[PDB]
């Protein structure tokens, strides 16, 4: 050949096949053979216990607080409302500058909320301001694409995902990108921090998910297997597994130590994509927010579909389980967060 | 602790009344998305609206026609894979698709993008206002006769100018046939899907046109009229 591009393409494919062999080498059994003797969960019929109204447009992101009581919701009317989920009272109603918010987070200390969207800016708002009104405190600039998701580590570090195919760890005070994560080809759509803040994964429109080491700025693992755009992601509560949902109407569970897909959750009556995924507190139940307006609760061990949450009249855009596992909330484009248990 | 329940209740009261005023303002604002390839004049259209009618390469503009507010925004700072942030625009009143009718080879890109927009699962109900921009340059190319449409779209050779065409005073029939051919090339896709949930409204525009707000007003009004009709099963 001689042309260094063709020699790199050849050694690239050679490496990809060494990776496929080292991955199938440890793929001794399947999850179904191992989990064939467990009893099925049966039927899980949760009911709407609360309905949280007020939003004037489609809800696009939501996030429980650490106390499992408060939650922040971002709607595309330019608002970010904080709810006391027990009493359905609104604690704050923060107007936004750019009305196209796409993500919103709740700092684990409850001191700050964040949000961003097509403005390519992550805005931090201090809920504990003293003299006056909750207003903007910091504002993280730098992305050349739309910001799709963000989650706090602590009151000073926050990670963002953007449509410029990169993720970034920020120091909120200095406003500098203390660490940049590059390598995705398509738009990064969702990220989920491990329960120990140490690593985080991201799913992009190149049908690939990547595991990133937060502190070192290097891409540790790249997982493939999905046929189309990955729309949602969430670590297994243990930290050594994570689930992805994609537009190909399938959910997939990947393991970190085995470095391959473990199980695929699908039904031949399910064709529409997937918008959100999240495990229960014990990880036995996997909730997914399909486009057909329902949320299916799958048994994460048997790949069987178990229950449905048919309470939304339009696409379920986001969801989230409390940190104590007592209830799950679902935000949809009908502008009504709903609490279920 | 009853004090804290009453404080939460009155915080909810002040919030809900702020949210009620916000609901009325947002409810009365007609959001308009400006879309189209680049080198087509989207940002120039927004620039023209801010200077003629008023407003706020900046993404947004806010303007009033007959006491009805509109907010037209063109997204500029993204990549070219518009396949995912486009779903952020499902509730807009209309999409204003602007197409450089004088760029004979990036025109197929505009046709493919319009077709992909028209059949999108999440924009199935978003009506589109079609702006066939740069008509003066199109007339320049047609009168020059150096780059003919037939070399890129051979159908144009057998194409007949529609009998309903209304050319403006002083226009060569070749230019009329060219611009109505591009019009029907986009209308055959917009009408091939059907279902009545949304429609396409073509308009011939140039960069110096000043009435390009009354046209958007008229057509947003037409869109709302037809939505209200198709709701009561009349139309």
């Amino acid at each position: 050949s001689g042309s260094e591009l063709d020699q790199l393409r050849q050694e690239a494919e050679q490496l990809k096949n060494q990776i496929r062999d080292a991955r199938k080498a440890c793929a001794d059994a399947t999850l179904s053979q191992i989990t064939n003797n467990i009893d099925p969960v049966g039927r899980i019929q949760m009911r709407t216990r609360r309905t949280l109204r007020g939003h004037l447009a489609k809800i696009y992101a939501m996030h429980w607080g650490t106390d499992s009581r408060l939650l922040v919701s971002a709607s595309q009317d330019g608002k970010l409302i904080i709810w006391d989920s027990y009493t359905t009272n609104k604690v704050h109603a923060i107007p936004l500058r750019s009305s196209w918010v796409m993500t919103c987070a709740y700092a684990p200390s409850g001191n700050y909320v964040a949000c961003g969207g097509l403005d390519n800016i992550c805005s931090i708002y201090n809920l504990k301001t003293r003299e006056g009104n909750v207003r903007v405190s910091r504002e993280l600039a730098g992305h050349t694409g739309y910001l799709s998701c963000c989650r706090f580590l602590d009151d000073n570090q926050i990670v963002t995902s953007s449509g410029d195919t990169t993720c970034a760890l920020w120091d909120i005070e200095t406003g500098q990108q203390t660490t940049t994560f590059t390598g995705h080809t398509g738009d990064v759509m969702s990220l989920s921090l491990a329960p120990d803040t140490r690593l985080f994964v991201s799913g992009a429109c190149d049908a690939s998910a990547k595991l990133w080491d937060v502190r070192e700025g290097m891409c540790r693992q790249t997982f493939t297997g999905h046929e189309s755009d990955i729309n949602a992601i969430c670590f297994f509560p243990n930290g050594n597994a994570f689930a992805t949902g994609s537009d190909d109407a399938t959910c997939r569970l990947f393991d970190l130590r085995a470095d391959q897909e473990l199980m695929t959750y699908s039904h031949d009556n399910i064709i529409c994509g997937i918008t959100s995924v999240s495990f229960s507190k014990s990880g036995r139940l996997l909730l997914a927010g399909y486009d057909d307006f329902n949320c299916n609760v799958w048994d994460a061990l048997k790949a069987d579909r178990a229950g449905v949450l048919a309470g939304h009249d339009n696409r379920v855009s986001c969801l989230g389980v409390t940190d104590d596992g007592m209830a799950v909330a679902t935000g949809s484009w009908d502008s009504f967060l709903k609490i279920w248990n | 602790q009853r004090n804290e329940e009453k404080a939460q209740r009155e915080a909810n009261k002040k919030i809900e009344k702020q949210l009620q005023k916000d609901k009325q303002v947002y409810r009365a604002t007609h959001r308009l998305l400006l879309l189209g390839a680049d080198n087509s004049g989207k940002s120039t259209i927004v620039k023209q609206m801010r200077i003629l009618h008023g407003g706020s390469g900046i993404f947004e503009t806010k303007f009033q026609v007959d006491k009805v507010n509109f907010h037209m925004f063109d997204v500029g700072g993204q990549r070219d894979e518009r396949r995912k942030w486009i779903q952020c625009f499902n509730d807009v009143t209309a999409i204003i698709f602007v197409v450089d009718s004088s760029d004979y080879n990036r025109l197929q890109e505009a046709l493919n993008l319009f077709k992909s927009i028209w059949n999108n699962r999440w924009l199935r109900t978003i009506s589109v206002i079609l702006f066939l921009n740069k008509q003066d340059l199109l007339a320049e190319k047609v009168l020059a006769g150096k780059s003919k449409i037939e070399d890129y779209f051979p159908e144009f050779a057998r194409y007949t100018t529609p009998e309903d065409a209304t050319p403006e005073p002083g226009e060569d029939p070749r230019v009329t046939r060219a611009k109505y051919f591009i019009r029907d090339e986009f209308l055959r896709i917009s009408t091939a899907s059907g279902d009545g949930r949304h429609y396409c409204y073509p308009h011939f525009t140039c960069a110096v046109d000043t009435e390009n707000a009354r046209r958007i007003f008229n057509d947003c009004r037409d869109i709302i009229q037809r939505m209200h009709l198709r709701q009561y099963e009349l139309l």
């Epitope: 080809t185 | 992909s116 699962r121």
Partner: nanobody
């Protein structure tokens, strides 16, 4: 991992013929609408022709109408662009792109730099 391997394509005189075979591996071929996107040297990506999920409805760019054909075989899991009467301007790399979503009629796959579900190209050169 979704990957598309194209084959065929070499030096061919004007008015000749060729057949570019695009084999897909890593998904279900039948569900996705397929396109042929060619890139001529020195210009951006250009879209040539698309065939639906089962060869039901096909469509072509004007310039290649009446010259090229596009066939899809789900059995062998591939599609073929059979080109005849090639002109000196048909010189281009030929990616065989797939749109990113199943069970639909729309796609946005002529992207400027990076789209993840199109192949690498077989530079078809045609000159005298």
């Amino acid at each position: 991992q979704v990957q598309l391997q194209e084959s065929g394509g070499g030096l061919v005189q004007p008015g000749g013929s060729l057949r570019l075979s695009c084999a897909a591996s890593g998904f279900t071929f039948s569900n996705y609408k397929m396109n042929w996107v060619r890139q001529a040297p020195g210009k951006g990506l250009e879209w040539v022709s698309d065939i639906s999920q089962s060869g039901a409805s096909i469509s072509y760019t004007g310039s290649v109408k009446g010259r090229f054909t596009i066939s899809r075989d789900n059995a062998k899991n591939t599609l073929y662009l059979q080109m005849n009467s090639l002109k000196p301007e048909d010189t281009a790399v030929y990616y065989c792109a797939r749109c990113p979503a199943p069970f639909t009629r729309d796609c946005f796959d002529v992207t400027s730099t990076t789209y993840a579900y199109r192949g690498q190209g077989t530079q078809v050169t045609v000159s005298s």
